[PDB]
Paper text:
The HR1N region in this construct was designed specifically to stabilize the prefusion Du172.17 Env and thus is different from the HR1N region that was designed for BG505 Env. Little difference was observed in the overall Env structure (Cα root mean square deviation [RMSD] = 0.6 Å) between BG505 gp140.664.R1 and Du172.17 gp140.664.R4 except in the 8-aa HR1N segment. As expected, Du172.17 gp140.664.R4 adopted a protomer structure similar to BG505 SOSIP.664 (79), B41 SOSIP.664 (88), and 16055 NFL.664 (31) with a Cα RMSD of 0.6 Å. Altogether, the low Cα RMSD values observed for SOSIP, NFL, and HR1-redesigned trimers suggest that the HR1N modification has no adverse impact on the overall architecture and compactness of this clade C Env. The crystal structure of a novel tier 2 clade C T/F Env confirmed the effectiveness of HR1 redesign in Env stabilization and provided a structurally defined, native-like trimer for NP display and in vivo assessment.
The envelope glycoprotein (Env) on HIV-1 virions mediates cell entry and is the target of broadly neutralizing antibodies (bNAbs). The N terminus of heptad repeat 1 (HR1N, residues 547 to 569) was identified as a major cause of Env metastability, leading to the design of cleaved, HR1-redesigned trimers or UFO trimers with removal of the cleavage site between gp120 and gp41 (19). First, we identified tier 2 mouse NAbs that were elicited by a 60-meric I3-01 NP presenting 20 HR1-redesigned BG505 trimers.
Residue numbers in the entry:
A (entry chain A): 1 to 240
B (entry chain H): 2 to 82, 82A, 82B, 82C, 83 to 100, 100A, 100B, 100C, ...
C (entry chain T): 518 to 547, 547A, 547B, 547C, 547D, 547E, 547F, 547G, ...
D (entry chain G): 32 to 138, 152 to 185, 188 to 309, 312 to 321, 321A, 322 to 402, 413 to 504
E (entry chain E): 1 to 213
F (entry chain L): 1 to 60, 61A, 62B, 63C, 64 to 92, 93A, 94B, 95C, ...
Amino acid sequence: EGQLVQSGAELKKPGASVKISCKTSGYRFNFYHINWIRQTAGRGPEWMGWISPYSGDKNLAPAFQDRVIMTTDTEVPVTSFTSTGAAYMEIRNLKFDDTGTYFCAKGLLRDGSSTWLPYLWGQGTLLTVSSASTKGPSVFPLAPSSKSTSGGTAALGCLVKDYFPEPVTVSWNSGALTSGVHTFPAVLQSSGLYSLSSVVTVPSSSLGTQTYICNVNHKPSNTKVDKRVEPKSCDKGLEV
Amino acid sequence: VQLQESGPGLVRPSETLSVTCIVSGGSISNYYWTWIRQSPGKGLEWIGYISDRETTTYNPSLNSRAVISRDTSKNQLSLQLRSVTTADTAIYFCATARRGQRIYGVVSFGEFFYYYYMDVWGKGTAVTVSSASTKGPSVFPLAPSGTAALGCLVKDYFPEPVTVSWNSGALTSGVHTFPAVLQSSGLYSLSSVVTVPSSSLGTQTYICNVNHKPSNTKVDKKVEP
Amino acid sequence: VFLGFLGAAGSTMGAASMTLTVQARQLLSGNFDIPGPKTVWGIKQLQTRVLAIERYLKDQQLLGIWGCSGKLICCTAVPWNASWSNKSYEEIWGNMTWMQWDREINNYTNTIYSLLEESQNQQEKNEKDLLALD
Amino acid sequence: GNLWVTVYYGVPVWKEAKTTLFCASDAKAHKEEVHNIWATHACVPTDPNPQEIVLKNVTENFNMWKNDMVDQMHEDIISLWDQSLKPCVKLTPLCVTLNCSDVKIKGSDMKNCSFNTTTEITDKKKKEYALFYKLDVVALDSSEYRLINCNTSAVTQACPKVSFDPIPIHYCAPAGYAILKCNNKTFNGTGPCNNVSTVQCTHGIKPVVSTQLLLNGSLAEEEVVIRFENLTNNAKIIIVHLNESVEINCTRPSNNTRKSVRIGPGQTFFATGDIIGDIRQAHCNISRKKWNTTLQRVKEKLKEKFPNKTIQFAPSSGGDLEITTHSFNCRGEFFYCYTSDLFNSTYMSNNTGGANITLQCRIKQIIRMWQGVGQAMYAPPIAGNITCKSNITGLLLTRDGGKEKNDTETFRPGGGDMRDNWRSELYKYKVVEIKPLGIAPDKCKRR
Amino acid sequence: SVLTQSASVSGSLGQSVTISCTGPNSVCCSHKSISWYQWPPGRAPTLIIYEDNERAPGISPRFSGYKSYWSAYLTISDLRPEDETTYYCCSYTHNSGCVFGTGTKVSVLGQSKANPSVTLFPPSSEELQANKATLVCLISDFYPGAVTVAWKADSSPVKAGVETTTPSKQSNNKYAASSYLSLTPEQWKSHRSYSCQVTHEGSTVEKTVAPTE
Amino acid sequence: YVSPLSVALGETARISCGRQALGSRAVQWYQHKPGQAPILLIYNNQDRPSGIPERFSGTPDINFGTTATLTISGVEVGDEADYYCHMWDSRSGFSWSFGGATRLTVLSQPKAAPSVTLFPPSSEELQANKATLVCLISDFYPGAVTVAWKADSSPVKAGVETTTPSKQSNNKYAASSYLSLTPEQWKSHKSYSCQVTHEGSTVEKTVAPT
Ligand SMILES: *[C@@H]1O[C@H](CO)[C@@H](O[C@@H]2O[C@H](CO)[C@@H](O[C@@H]3O[C@H](CO[C@H]4O[C@H](CO[C@H]5O[C@H](CO)[C@@H](O)[C@H](O)[C@@H]5O)[C@@H](O)[C@H](O[C@H]5O[C@H](CO)[C@@H](O)[C@H](O)[C@@H]5O)[C@@H]4O)[C@@H](O)[C@H](O[C@H]4O[C@H](CO)[C@@H](O)[C@H](O)[C@@H]4O[C@H]4O[C@H](CO)[C@@H](O)[C@H](O)[C@@H]4O[C@H]4O[C@H](CO)[C@@H](O)[C@H](O)[C@@H]4O)[C@@H]3O)[C@H](O)[C@H]2NC(C)=O)[C@H](O)[C@H]1NC(C)=O
Ligand SMILES: *[C@@H]1O[C@H](CO)[C@@H](O[C@@H]2O[C@H](CO)[C@@H](O[C@@H]3O[C@H](CO[C@H]4O[C@H](CO[C@H]5O[C@H](CO)[C@@H](O)[C@H](O)[C@@H]5O[C@H]5O[C@H](CO)[C@@H](O)[C@H](O)[C@@H]5O)[C@@H](O)[C@H](O[C@H]5O[C@H](CO)[C@@H](O)[C@H](O)[C@@H]5O)[C@@H]4O)[C@@H](O)[C@H](O[C@H]4O[C@H](CO)[C@@H](O)[C@H](O)[C@@H]4O[C@H]4O[C@H](CO)[C@@H](O)[C@H](O)[C@@H]4O)[C@@H]3O)[C@H](O)[C@H]2NC(C)=O)[C@H](O)[C@H]1NC(C)=O
Ligand SMILES: *[C@@H]1O[C@H](CO)[C@@H](O[C@@H]2O[C@H](CO)[C@@H](O[C@@H]3O[C@H](CO[C@H]4O[C@H](CO)[C@@H](O)[C@H](O)[C@@H]4O)[C@@H](O)[C@H](O[C@H]4O[C@H](CO)[C@@H](O)[C@H](O)[C@@H]4O)[C@@H]3O)[C@H](O)[C@H]2NC(C)=O)[C@H](O)[C@H]1NC(C)=O
Ligand SMILES: *[C@@H]1O[C@H](CO)[C@@H](O[C@@H]2O[C@H](CO)[C@@H](O[C@@H]3O[C@H](CO)[C@@H](O)[C@H](O)[C@@H]3O)[C@H](O)[C@H]2NC(C)=O)[C@H](O)[C@H]1NC(C)=O
Ligand SMILES: *[C@@H]1O[C@H](CO)[C@@H](O[C@@H]2O[C@H](CO)[C@@H](O[C@@H]3O[C@H](CO)[C@@H](O)[C@H](O)[C@@H]3O)[C@H](O)[C@H]2NC(C)=O)[C@H](O)[C@H]1NC(C)=O
Ligand SMILES: *[C@@H]1O[C@H](CO)[C@@H](O[C@@H]2O[C@H](CO)[C@@H](O[C@@H]3O[C@H](CO)[C@@H](O)[C@H](O)[C@@H]3O)[C@H](O)[C@H]2NC(C)=O)[C@H](O)[C@H]1NC(C)=O
Ligand SMILES: *[C@@H]1O[C@H](CO)[C@@H](O[C@@H]2O[C@H](CO)[C@@H](O[C@@H]3O[C@H](CO)[C@@H](O)[C@H](O)[C@@H]3O)[C@H](O)[C@H]2NC(C)=O)[C@H](O)[C@H]1NC(C)=O
Ligand SMILES: *[C@@H]1O[C@H](CO)[C@@H](O[C@@H]2O[C@H](CO)[C@@H](O)[C@H](O)[C@H]2NC(C)=O)[C@H](O)[C@H]1NC(C)=O
Ligand SMILES: *[C@@H]1O[C@H](CO)[C@@H](O[C@@H]2O[C@H](CO)[C@@H](O)[C@H](O)[C@H]2NC(C)=O)[C@H](O)[C@H]1NC(C)=O
Ligand SMILES: *[C@@H]1O[C@H](CO)[C@@H](O[C@@H]2O[C@H](CO)[C@@H](O)[C@H](O)[C@H]2NC(C)=O)[C@H](O)[C@H]1NC(C)=O
Ligand SMILES: *[C@@H]1O[C@H](CO)[C@@H](O)[C@H](O)[C@H]1NC(C)=O
Ligand SMILES: *[C@@H]1O[C@H](CO)[C@@H](O)[C@H](O)[C@H]1NC(C)=O
Ligand SMILES: *[C@@H]1O[C@H](CO)[C@@H](O)[C@H](O)[C@H]1NC(C)=O
Ligand SMILES: *[C@@H]1O[C@H](CO)[C@@H](O)[C@H](O)[C@H]1NC(C)=O
């Protein structure tokens, strides 16, 4: 049960620095190395470097040997075989080609010929580096449409428009609605704005028996928007 | 400091002896005053003491018959002793005590004690207890008769003591007042003789002054050959 | 590496196999106690160090009824059943420790003890007996 | 992929179990020449070269409050008292009638008693006298008194050739077992120790029986440690390891002496003869500056378990004197001191500091040690004055209960159970057995 | 990245597919160990093969590895629908770092194609109050990753304000995408109907909305 | 109550206290001469007030067992007195008793010849029907003196009142004897003689009625 959680997605100014964290659980944090691997749109995946939470021995990539520093915190013993550790990677002199998704990963084995190999990967940390200010989105409700006339299915959602920081999460009924939810990727405008749409497929008969609310959370702007989709359908294929 | 005692000299039994102590050279409210007596054939007996807070403590051998007080107005000390007997005939001194606290351990545990001691004393007043009565002394001059001696004989008195002076402070070198004798009559008698040069006779005056405080017999006798 | 008694208890199982002899001698003699403690509470230590001999001899006999005798590491002829652990080599000896491994065998250890003896050497010695006459 | 079972004898595997440990009499004490010490009666030599082995990557669970080494040590001390007090002179005939009278102080308590004892022969009888402190019952209330132990149990005098000086004792692990030791300095007491050593014998532990104030213990080397058995449950012991040692110097200055009175064929009873010199009770001095600093440090450390709650402490509850006193031993005499002025602080600054801080201390002679198989021991008197210096290194505290979540929390001294005294030194050790036989799949086969 | 892989390989459902991984004499094989990673874009990758041919814990024996003196190969036996994603290889030693390759996209053919579900949404009144108009055309559940969106304002093509997203792989082995048409209120009122036309490789789905409705 | 102690002249005298202290003590030494105020010699075991000579020392209180002893180095003829040891300690409470006196007798003193002076009765005494012959002896050491009376060389046995010898300022003894006679007995015998014998020195003075 080696689940490993990374830090949150951030937006930093070029020339500054940022420190990404990696908190572990389910195993002995001192038994396996911690690897850092980045992925940018330009050069694809690239291995940044690994560090040993036990001995402190590290191996950095020569490209990142200048502007990257890896550190680890001492593990907090929970049981005889599990602990809670943390690994930090601080990168400085941020540029444009460094915007992307960064991962920390657990090593494979404790001894052999491929010990440091990244085996368990975290959920990733999105890092954007630009001069544009953090702009919050404007959530709009979507009118229901007909998906199946003979079956009676409505499709209704929410539109998240105009925001600079990439990551934005959408839930339904505070997470109490997971069936039929489909969130589409964002879009790259000519102005540098991102916008996406989420849609849930509900029955056409559940208009007075269930309330559908979309919760849009945007952490880089620290904004929460709760929108109520109006059940008043407008498609001609659904009113019948 | 100076301490001078005073008393009646004679007290009848079943009465109350009383003595006074005049102090000089200091104050009376900042010191502690004790009384000491001495009976014939007995050592110094401790009577009691009085404090600066004007609180008194007496010897349990006196059977609570003693009582001490103070007098800051006249700067004097008092002592009274009720129900006197023949055994209370004594010379009474008043003395000054000085606090000394002998500590041999933790003061909080009470590992200390007080040890009474009195640096200053007085000459002491003599007081006799008898059912008899005082008698004036008969003073006779002894004419000189080649060794040059000039004496006065106090032939019969009671009780002791008797002060014999010679021209106040004009005769002190040759003065010799022999101790009194107890005759079988209960009457004391003494002789005070001086050595005067032979050439001084016929031209100089020599009187002996006799003071008997119990029974006022202040008598000055002029001696001539 | 040597490390010492119980040194490789956190090390991998393979690395701990190098020091089987170190943790073996510490199971028997703890240096002679010179003249004996006698007195009242001497029977306490006497029974506690007779039980040690009993346990050691029971282990040696469990070895002897198997093929493993006079040797620490010893291979046998019982195939590893998959329903035990269900893990690969190197997934074990390079990832696990001996404590963590013992944690995953106690459920099925009493049956492996049976297969290693009633079916292995009781058949093996029978074969060697029946094949040493012709 | 195609493996076979393989046997490995001697794998580093252990299992929690209970056993009876050994003991070491240090260097046998050849310089003392005396052979009347509880430990030197039956323990192995010291083995001058210890063997401590770090166990890398190991995190073992410990629980000082469920440690069996403590129970073993307590049972050993209990069964050792009786074995030490068995071939010694008993004072059963001394249960006679005593005349008794207070100390002279011709105008502190210690009675001057006289009794009709048996002489060297049993047909004749003589009368003796002795000073019996204060441990006497009024019988029926110069007033007739009675020895206190002639009510319940019996009395036996401690052998004068045996000394009550604590010798360093350390327990050794038997064959097939090992002692795991927590090397974490600032440790809970219960939980997973992040790095563990293994040993055969522990460190030289001195069996110092005491209450409230732990003496001659082991100082925690990084700040002070407050170890609980249950921080919510008020009826549990709270052990405190200090950082620095607090000097404590106790004295009985009263120049006494001993009388050897003959009672029976060949056994002589030692009693407290007449006092020679000034008389004064026992007393202990504890430097006020050091104790005030220790109090403020323990207070700041106690504010961790309670964020927004003020903490105060008062003296012991009262009643039973054995629980509410800093009882200990001092060259033979069992000093029972009062510790009210130690925990009556905050409102304490009289005389611009007490400089030395002196605590009154009585002495007893007839003790019942936790009712260990009944009986009672008469401590023989020591001729002369007595002085003993020691180091306070630990404390035993207890928290009050009730609707106390409002303002403050009270921490009064305690004790009673002598097992917590051993817990303050066996909190880091645990005894485990080795399971050397392991089986693992490998790539090999026989024949 | 000097470690060159295969550009894009196709496979048949139920059969096998082999990916190549080779590079210069400095960064390949013989002395170096090759590993393989299934890397779903936007999600965490998965270890499948390490040390040339040894699989990872939990990996089905369908995956196989091989290494020659000049190139390594990853063999995927019994192709599954969920096996249609990107695959990378790594060349490493015992104390070095991971050297990732170019990348290989594997397409699994022979599956039942899906009918693209297209839904068009006009802007709401809250957006009309902001003097903005955005038509949202959401496409979901189609198998071939090739769609072309055309926006027609009253049967007339629109070139400005069109922003089409790249197709992403749905969690149900399908694909989805979206297209946003940005229009001003003056252009929103001065037309009768708008049409989003998604031209599929074997069909065409058109959705028409009207500002008056 | 008096404890006699004879000490030779010039050497050192050691007067031991009468009561042994039971604990830490606080001893005082008082010097009381017959007819004079008692002097405080040593208080607080060894502290000496202003005026007391350095020849007097008291054993200070140290450890325990030391006996309170007053040491007089080089005694003189003027040191013969009563010595009181006021004993205080921690195990006797309030001590009212000054303790028994220790009268010091300095021996090895040069003797002196007894000076005798005889006085016949006075005229005012003869006219008062009384008669007393006064024999005054003074300045002699030691005090052993035997007074006798003779009348025309005939020993007078009755009517003799002789004081006990007592030294005065010069530390030499002085005694007085009185012969009580009637006026008709005084003129009766022609020569009355007081004959004193001190250390064998027999000196006699005679008077005659004139
Ligand atoms: C736990 O803590 C507690 C409390 O903290 C400790 O308890 C303490 O224990 C000690 C030890 O017993 C006790 O001391 C005894 O103390 C007394 C008194 O102490 C003092 O008083 C002296 C005099 O003071 C006063 O008089 C003067 C006039 O002279 C006046 O002006 C002043 O205002 C005041 O009224 C002080 O001089 C003295 O100061 C000095 O000495 C200290 C110790 O060296 C030093 O620390 C100071 O800095 C300062 O230098 C102090 O304040 C002591 O007198 C006594 O000593 C004697 O008694 C034993 C028998 O018990 C005897 O054998 C000794 O020889 C000694 O006796 C001398 O003094 C007598 C007069 O008092 C005299 O009669 C004797 O003949 C003898 O004299 C000769 O020596 C003196 C000098 O002493 C010399 O001048 C003479 O010429 C002659 O040669 C003890 O030491 C504490 O009282 C006690 N405290 C409490 C609160 O209970 C406990 O010990 C601790 N326990 C442990 C285990 O740690
Ligand atoms: C308790 O728990 C612990 C944690 O779980 C546990 O530790 C685990 O222990 C095992 C065994 O002890 C460890 O095992 C292995 O890992 C080694 C990793 O590395 C060594 O390399 C490190 C990184 O080196 C790079 O960076 C350095 C700078 O920091 C450079 O100087 C290096 O040159 C190297 O650089 C590379 O990259 C550059 C680009 O960045 C490039 O330019 C350059 O050219 C180069 O390619 C070093 O930091 C490290 O240094 C330490 O340790 C050694 C040994 O103690 C010291 O001598 C050093 O001074 C330094 O302190 C190491 O040098 C692997 O090397 C190792 O592999 C070899 O051995 C195994 C068998 O064990 C073989 O299967 C394998 O094939 C390798 O074999 C080869 O080497 C051996 C000699 O080692 C040789 O005989 C053989 O023939 C063959 O050639 C093995 O995989 C494991 O890492 C630990 N885990 C963790 C998380 O730390 C411990 O055991 C537990 N138990 C206890 C304590 O009792
Ligand atoms: C219980 O009983 C124990 C033992 O009997 C007592 O412990 C002793 O305590 C005293 C005082 O607390 C200690 O005495 C002190 O020693 C210090 C160290 O001494 C030397 O080392 C320095 C190192 O630099 C040298 O420079 C120096 O020359 C010495 O060689 C001294 O520093 C102390 O001095 C202070 O006073 C002097 C005198 O005025 C000054 O000159 C100094 O500058 C300084 O201010 C002091 O002398 C003694 O060492 C302790 N012994 C032991 C064995 O520990 C307990 O105090 C006692 N507790 C109670 C409550 O009663
Ligand atoms: C090194 O050994 C450890 C075991 O000590 C390996 O960890 C184990 O990995 C398996 C999967 O390979 C886990 O099984 C899973 O359990 C979860 C429980 O929720 C279940 O939902 C899954 O279906 C699966 O059965 C197992 O829990 C896990 N154990 C521990 C203690 O983490 C580890 O993978 C090994 N590392 C290697 C070989 O690199
Ligand atoms: C023999 O043993 C009995 C025990 O059964 C003794 O009786 C007990 O003596 C104690 C001591 O005083 C009593 O305790 C006290 O109670 C008072 C209030 O009554 C309290 O103020 C004290 O603090 C103390 O706690 C106890 O009550 C008493 N018990 C009985 C049942 O009488 C007895 O004293 C012993 N000695 C004999 C009989 O000579
Ligand atoms: C030795 O054992 C002790 C406990 O038995 C270990 O200490 C505990 O260590 C953790 C993390 O090192 C401490 O946690 C933290 O507390 C701070 C302050 O509130 C907080 O800001 C952090 O987020 C974290 O929660 C914990 O407080 C500490 N226990 C106590 C009672 O303080 C210690 O780490 C072990 N020694 C070594 C070298 O690891
Ligand atoms: C023994 O353990 C106690 C545990 O309380 C230690 O106490 C505290 O020690 C620290 C030093 O680590 C003191 O801190 C410092 O404070 C001063 C100001 O007083 C500041 O200038 C320094 O920069 C540092 O921050 C602290 O004051 C002290 N007391 C408390 C209540 O925390 C003690 O130091 C230990 N002693 C030894 C010898 O190990
Ligand atoms: C130190 O002691 C505390 C008190 O019990 C421990 O706290 C508990 O720890 C267990 C084990 O992880 C948890 O299940 C409980 O929920 C904890 N309760 C509280 C109130 O904290 C703590 O874990 C101990 N730490 C160490 C390192 O031993
Ligand atoms: C647990 O960790 C502590 C802290 O690193 C170790 O402590 C030191 O141990 C060494 C080895 O004996 C000593 O030389 C140092 O003086 C110790 N320092 C301190 C501050 O404790 C301890 O040894 C470790 N124990 C184990 C079993 O690994
Ligand atoms: C305890 O009491 C006894 C007897 O009442 C005391 O002994 C008497 O002591 C005096 C003086 O020391 C002797 O003369 C007696 O002969 C003793 N009596 C007996 C019967 O021996 C004893 O002193 C008292 N204890 C103390 C410390 O004073
Ligand atoms: C493993 O043991 C189980 C239980 O006895 C048995 O059903 C199974 O067939 C065994 N497997 C092998 C491969 O022997
Ligand atoms: C001891 O016995 C005697 C009789 O020989 C008796 O008078 C005395 O009272 C007894 N002692 C006590 C303390 O009763
Ligand atoms: C600690 O105390 C709580 C409440 O008093 C209790 O529920 C719990 O069982 C205790 N834990 C122990 C004694 O280990
Ligand atoms: C603390 O001590 C002082 C002084 O003896 C006393 O007045 C006060 O009552 C004490 N406080 C307590 C709580 O006992």
